[PDB]
Nucleic acid binder design. Structure first.
Ligand SMILES: [Zn+2]
Ligand SMILES: [Zn+2]
Lengths: 166, 166
RNA sequence: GGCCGCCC
RNA sequence: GGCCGCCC
């Protein structure tokens, strides 16, 4: 019965307060909450874990580690979904700030964000389209694509070599 | 029916391969797996999150972040249990290495470690005693105690000020 | 922050 | 790596 006003929030690093993106760029992909703002990568450091995920999916590859570019806090993980690299920001690494309300809060779960702060809808085709080529516009961002491509390649090889048993 | 041989393992940083401690120093405290080797702190970087845990316990305080001192990977969290500061290492940040077997493995859960690698028993009084003054022997370690004491102080104040409502 | 269970 | 539930 208690509905929020679905305001716009800034999503900030809870360690150094740098802003990653606005709330309206969060979209879900089957319970995975991802950022579909192509500018977000500028604010993220991408680094290989040098270990393939134990969850081996073709559609939904958990790949490189993502850190705040400023302070290097671990803020989530990059995925490859439907051929597209996407940042998944951890809700516990964020602070949500609303300017007009003069309010700032943390939340323990993304479902708490949806309940208390702002609505989050399912990502659709245009969201994947706008993110597909987001990493080819800055030298820093091109180096990040190299990491992701390498992790994705090893992920695919691990899945192929396990399927060799079957 | 399939029993392991309960060998000694080195617990190493999965990012940089620095050794934190031996397996025989892991002990559990009510499903929390902690390190009771007083030398381990030398290998850990302690940093305030500057945010009190949402789990407010008198007996079991989750406190400062712990990182590998060498490579700064997030490897767990420090707790205060029974008046004692203890490192809790994340099982997913470790690689387990057994020299005589010539073997090295990751595990996804501490219960998998117990099932496949080595037994882990409940911590007892002498374990807390040996850890009580582990942070007063190096300049680096004394600075770590300052962080922990500050986080514990704010934790206690947060719990006291919430209990003010009741 | 942790444990275990289920699911992706 | 994530989701949700329970527990510490
Ligand atoms: Zn930051
Ligand atoms: Zn390390």
């Amino acid at each position: 019965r208690l509905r929020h006003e679905n305001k716009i929030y800034k999503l900030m690093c809870s360690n150094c307060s740098k802003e990653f993106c606005k709330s309206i760029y969060i979209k879900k992909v089957f319970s995975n909450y991802m950022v579909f703002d192509p500018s977000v990568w500028r604010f993220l450091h991408v680094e290989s874990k040098r270990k393939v995920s134990k969850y081996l999916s073709e559609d939904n590859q958990p790949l490189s580690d993502i850190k705040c570019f400023h302070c290097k806090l671990d803020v989530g993980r990059a995925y490859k979904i439907r051929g597209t690299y996407l940042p998944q920001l951890s809700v516990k690494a964020l602070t949500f700030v609303q300017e007009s309300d003069y309010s700032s809060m943390t939340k323990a779960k993304w479902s708490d964000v949806e309940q208390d702060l702002f609505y989050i809808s399912e990502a659709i085709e245009d969201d994947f389209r706008i993110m597909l080529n987001a990493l080819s516009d800055t030298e820093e961002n091109i180096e990040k694509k190299i990491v992701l491509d390498l992790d994705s390649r090893q992920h695919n090889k691990q899945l192929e070599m396990k399927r060799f048993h079957i």
